[PDB]
Design a protein around this ligand. Structure first.
Ligand SMILES: [Mg+2]
Ligand SMILES: [Mg+2]
Ligand SMILES: [Mg+2]
Ligand SMILES: [Mg+2]
Ligand SMILES: [Mg+2]
Ligand SMILES: [Mg+2]
Lengths: 127, 179, 96, 283, 211, 56, 14, 8
RNA sequence: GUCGACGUACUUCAUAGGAUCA
RNA sequence: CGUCGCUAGUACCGGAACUAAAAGUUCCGUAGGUGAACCUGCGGAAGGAUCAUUAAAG
RNA sequence: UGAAAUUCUUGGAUUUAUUGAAGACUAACUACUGCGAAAGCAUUUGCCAAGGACGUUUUCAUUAAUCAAGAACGAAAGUUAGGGGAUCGAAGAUGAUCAGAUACCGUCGUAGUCUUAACCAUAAACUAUGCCGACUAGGGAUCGGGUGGUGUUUUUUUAAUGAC
């Protein structure tokens, strides 16, 4: 009576994705991103954008038959930041409020044992 | 309001403060949010659950978990309570090495520059930007409104890249007046 | 004990004049405000004055003062302050 | 902005310009007009290019009600964007940001000025003045020396400019060559660009770059096409023939093992002629 | 012009008999024009807590790959094991030495696999030193002991038997007993299992595993 | 120095004459400015295709 | 601008 | 401490 | 050639500090 | 309230018609530089302002 | 991006899952703690030689300290000739050139970054602090070795070791 999917949340600096797929991960159920729910490209990473995206997928998933999702939140990772941003945090909160049952929450950020060089250069980046 | 659970693992260096502040942590969780609170000493993880017969706000559980998580990262209790009070607060986290690959004394001085003498520089950013900053070694966490945490992040990052505290302080006054 | 060792080790490495100058100034205020230092008896002052007259250690005939003066390094403001700081300290011990 | 206040250096600049009484002077970066008044005193008429309308108005106020008032003309706009009138001499204290374009514009004017007195920062001027084999010899030096002759007038220090800049300055004289030497600018610059990516390596190593081979092969195919000879146009059809051509010309000219920074004008001309002989055209 | 889920069809995934709870959810795939080929090779990762119904395995995940299809039932087989990132970040702490070993070995089923085991030093009950660092000789000895143990259990067992050993964590206790005299340790865990190579598929050996 | 300079001038004049013997236009030839790029956009590819078609 | 810890707790400022 | 080790 | 580097000879800018009094 | 203007448009044979027109951080070594009052790559230094928490195999 | 635009994109981009290939680098543990003459050194296992300290009622018996000449090594960058070429990236090109806390940003990216055989011999190569030897206060932390205990724990037969 309780069907599980997996809700993958990719919280980058300039956008947030909310992707719901079956347990395997091959089949996509609904992909909505911050850009599709906002008029100005500045606010795509905004928490408000994530909430709209999360609500849209939550509504769509209920139509399909999915009633619960495991959250696998991740950041860009790699040589860049490893912790999900507020866009991801907002998406998680909206999904909980949607009534969709949250099964298990884990961070799956790609963390390198040791990586290539970072794009900044010797003097740094992100003035 | 279905039966759901959250688990938040407490790192060892935050267990003792959790003990002294437990008296002020379970009341708001169990009273306002109508959540079932517990700590598993065997796993050393704070466990929160929704009571289907009593809990009414669907967002209580996730709201509570973020509040526990904020205390876990190193934020004082009252600041963490702000997560329960409000609904538009988020935590930004990034490392020094993300900004600039600093090692040895360069990393130590970068942390010292952010904190400032007697923590003055950190408080200056916190007051001007209306945010709370926890400076855990090379790991920096910022708590506040989304637009606010970005402003604090830029002031912090300028300090990491080498900008002197004095110049960053003047910039804080300008943005503070704009706010 | 480790925590003081780590903090003591780090403060040990920083040997910038401005940093050490700020710490010294704040310390002299706290000791002055709390009166940690005992009042000097008249006999104590006389003994201190006696040594100063015996030696004359705080005049410009010292090696450092003579080196800075004779080579135009005291025209700069900062090194002049140190010379004047030395001279006023000598004058204090000369007071009766 | 940085404003000169030393009168001696301004007098020296205007004097060394050697303005004949029948000369029309293009004066870039008028500023307040300390140079402009003296240039007006000993010139047929002055055309000034000013970016700031306020400064142009102040200059007009200064020159108002003076015997030289009819002589002056002021153009408002960006110097690079404007299409300029005939001028015999150039005397500029323009912002250094447009230093390099300015020079080449003076070189490519339909009738280039016979003399120009230009102030640059010390590094840029020394690179202009650099001779083959010097440390600062660079593409700019070779190109400008082919199209002109640059000599050093004076060294202007930091104290003269208020507020002091972080870089020292120098006044140099640029004398475009008349008649213009008959070499296509595009091909000269193309050869130099290919050879000056690393000026202290062998020229052959300069031609070893894969993208350089791609460009040269495409140029060879286009050259064959213009001569009405049929060319396959595949990506790697002509790689092996062009490689052999480059090797042979480099060997016979004896320039394969000579560093670009130590090669003078005639060496590059010989290489250009050899490449034209074998059929490779650069730009 | 077509809603894709009109043509999709649902399939129920069933786990090996070695786990208590065989029902592990369901997936979807396009209806045959075949659905089996897309279904085969599909890998699903699930926490051990769900399969065993006990929160003692909250920090371990099992990857199972689909190998057979019968009447909407996807018969899967063990494919890998791993720890959750939060647990690993929890164990790795300051003021202690991390001892990690890996061994490549083939089961009795020609299942070539790679086992990664992790352990940490601990301070004694009466210890007063801040740190419990182990000298490199002790680390090398412990690593050798762990390698011999893991090779011994893997070689003398089948893949199903290997998983049956993995679930109760007997290997961790065996490592603790063997390494007791060398140096005190904590958080001894079989951190990860990779399945590198596979033998020829035998549907009988899968049906027997699924009963 | 003077005699060396004059000999160089004569050599330069001869070489420049021989260069006028071998001279063409440069509109179609790809400039060496492209050495750093190493990859082209579809706009650049389309421009090259149009240019080559015009060449025939 | 204040350089000391704010007495008001973050909930209070908001 | 209520809830320290048991459900509260 | 109001040329570059070096060598030599000079010029110049950075001096006030404490106490009392009005 | 009239005439010719100026801007935009439509037509006609410089000319002659019509319509619209709310404005007033400090550096070191090395290597480069063609929008160079200075920039950039790699390695290093402080001669650059340490707040909070911390036995949780408790 | 402060907002845009060069860029990719219904021939399916970004995102998702199962793989595969290449070249670098060894996170967390990580600590001014350890090692080396210095520069420097961090995944496992094996081989080759080298080394300080400690223990010794072993051996030689002044063989020693400092060092012009002379020699070995010498970060990064850089040159010669092959190999490799993932990331980042001097140079070069190109989009935008509006807004001062976010004011130098973006995209492509040659040489380089890596390696083999040779050159170069410079650093804030810093403790801005020559090498050898003797002496002049207390305290408790840590690393390596050694001695002592009728100390705790393990060896879950003892024990002996190991760890405290
Ligand atoms: Mg060690
Ligand atoms: Mg020995
Ligand atoms: Mg040598
Ligand atoms: Mg090579
Ligand atoms: Mg060093
Ligand atoms: Mg001594």
């Amino acid at each position: 009576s309780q069907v599980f999917g997996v809700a993958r949340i990719y919280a980058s600096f300039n956008d947030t994705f909310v992707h719901v797929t079956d347990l395997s991960g091959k089949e996509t159920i609904a992909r909505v991103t911050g850009g599709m729910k906002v008029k100005a490209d500045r606010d795509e990473s905004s928490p408000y954008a994530a909430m709209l995206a999360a609500q849209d997928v939550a509504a769509k998933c209920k139509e399909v038959g999915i009633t619960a999702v495991h959250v696998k939140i991740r950041a860009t990772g790699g040589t860049r930041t490893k912790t999900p941003g507020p866009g991801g945090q907002a998406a998680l909160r909206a999904l909980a409020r949607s009534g969709l049952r949250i099964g298990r929450i884990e961070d799956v950020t790609p963390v390198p044992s040791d990586s290539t060089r970072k794009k900044g250069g010797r003097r740094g980046r992100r003035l | 309001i279905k039966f759901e659970s959250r688990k938040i693992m407490v790192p060892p260096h935050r267990m003792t403060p959790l003990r002294n502040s437990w008296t002020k942590i379970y009341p708001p969780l169990v009273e306002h949010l109508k959540l079932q609170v517990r700590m598993n000493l065997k796993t050393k993880s704070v466990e929160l659950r929704t009571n289907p017969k009593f809990t009414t706000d669907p967002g209580a559980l996730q709201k509570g978990a973020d509040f526990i998580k904020a205390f876990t990262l190193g934020f004082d209790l009252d600041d963490s309570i702000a997560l329960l009070r409000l609904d538009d607060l988020y935590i930004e986290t990034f490392e020094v090495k993300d900004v600039k690959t600093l090692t040895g004394d360069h990393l130590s001085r970068a942390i010292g520059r952010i904190a400032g003498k007697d923590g003055k520089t950190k408080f200056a950013i916190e007051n001007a930007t209306r945010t709370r900053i926890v400076l855990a070694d090379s790991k920096i966490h910022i708590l506040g409104g989304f637009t606010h945490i970005r402003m604090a992040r830029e002031s912090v990052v300028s300090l990491i890249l080498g900008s002197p505290p004095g110049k960053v302080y003047g910039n804080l006054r300008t943005v503070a007046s704009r706010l | 004990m480790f925590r003081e060792e780590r903090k003591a080790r780090r403060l040990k490495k920083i040997k910038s004049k401005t940093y050490r100058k700020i710490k010294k100034k704040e310390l002299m205020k706290n000791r002055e405000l709390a009166a940690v230092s005992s009042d000097e008896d008249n006999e104590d002052h006389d003994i201190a004055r006696a040594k100063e007259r015996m030696t004359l250690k705080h005049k410009t005939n010292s090696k450092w003062a003579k080196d800075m003066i004779k080579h135009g390094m005291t025209n700069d403001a900062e090194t002049r302050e140190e010379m004047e700081e030395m001279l006023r300290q000598g004058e204090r011990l000369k007071a009766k | 902005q940085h404003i000169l206040k030393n009168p001696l250096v301004a007098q020296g600049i205007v004097d060394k310009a050697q303005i004949r009484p029948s000369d029309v002077v293009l004066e870039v970066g008028p500023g307040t007009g300390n140079l402009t008044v003296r240039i007006l005193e000993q010139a047929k008429n002055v055309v000034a290019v000013e970016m700031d309308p306020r400064m142009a108005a102040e200059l007009t106020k200064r020159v108002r009600g003076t015997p030289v008032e009819k002589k002056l003309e002021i153009m408002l706009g960006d110097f690079m964007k404007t299409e300029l009138p005939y001028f015999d001499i150039c005397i500029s204290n323009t912002p250094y940001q447009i230093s390099s374009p300015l020079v080449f514009k003076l070189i490519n004017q339909p009738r280039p000025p016979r003399v120009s007195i230009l102030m640059f920062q010390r590094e840029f001027a020394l690179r202009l003045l650099a001779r083959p084999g010097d440390s600062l010899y660079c593409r700019l030096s070779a190109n400008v020396q082919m199209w002109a002759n640059v000599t050093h007038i004076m060294k202007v220090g930091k104290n003269n400019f208020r507020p002091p800049p972080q870089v020292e300055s120098s006044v140099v004289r640029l004398e475009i060559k008349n008649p213009r030497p008959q070499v296509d600018y595009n091909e000269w610059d193309g050869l130099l660009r290919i050879v000056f990516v690393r000026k202290n390596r062998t020229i052959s190593a300069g031609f070893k770059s894969t993208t350089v081979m791609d460009i040269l092969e495409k140029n060879y195919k286009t050259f064959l096409a213009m001569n009405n000879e049929m060319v396959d146009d595949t990506k790697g059809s002509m790689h092996d023939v062009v490689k052999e051509k480059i090797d042979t010309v480099l060997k016979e000219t004896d320039l394969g093992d000579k560093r670009a920074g130590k090669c003078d004008q005639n060496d590059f001309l010989r290489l250009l002629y050899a490449f034209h002989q074998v059929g490779i055209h650069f730009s | 012009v077509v809603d894709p889920f009109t043509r999709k069809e649902w399939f129920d995934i069933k786990a090996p008999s070695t786990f208590e709870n065989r029902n592990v959810g369901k997936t979807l795939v396009n209806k045959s024009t075949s659905a089996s080929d897309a279904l085969k090779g599909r890998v699903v990762e699930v926490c051990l807590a769900d399969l065993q119904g006990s929160e003692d395995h909250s920090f371990r995940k099992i990857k199972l790959r689909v190998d057979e299809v019968q009447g909407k039932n996807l018969l899967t087989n063990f494919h890998g094991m791993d720890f959750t990132t939060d647990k690993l970040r929890s164990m790795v702490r300051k003021w202690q030495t991390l001892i990690e070993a890996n061994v490549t070995v083939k089961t009795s089923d020609d299942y070539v696999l790679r086992i990664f085991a992790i352990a940490f030093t601990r301070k004694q009950a009466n210890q007063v030193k801040r740190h419990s660092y182990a000298q490199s000789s002790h680390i090398r000895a412990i690593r050798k002991v762990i390698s011999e143990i893991l090779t011994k259990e893997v070689q003398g067992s089948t893949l199903a038997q290997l998983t049956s050993k993995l679930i109760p964590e007997v290997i961790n206790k065996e490592i603790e007993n063997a390494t007791k005299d060398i140096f005190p340790l904590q958080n001894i865990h079989v951190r990860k299992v990779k399945l590198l190579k596979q033998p020829k598929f035998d549907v009988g050996a899968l049906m027997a595993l699924h009963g | 120095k003077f005699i060396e300079h004059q000999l160089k001038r004569e050599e330069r004049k001869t070489i420049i004459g021989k260069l006028q013997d071998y001279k063409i236009d440069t509109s179609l030839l790809t400039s060496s400015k492209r050495l750093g790029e190493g990859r082209q956009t579809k706009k650049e590819e389309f421009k090259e295709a149009l240019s080559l078609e015009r060449q025939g | 601008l204040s350089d000391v810890k704010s007495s008001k707790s973050l909930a209070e400022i908001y | 401490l209520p809830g320290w080790g048991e459900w509260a």
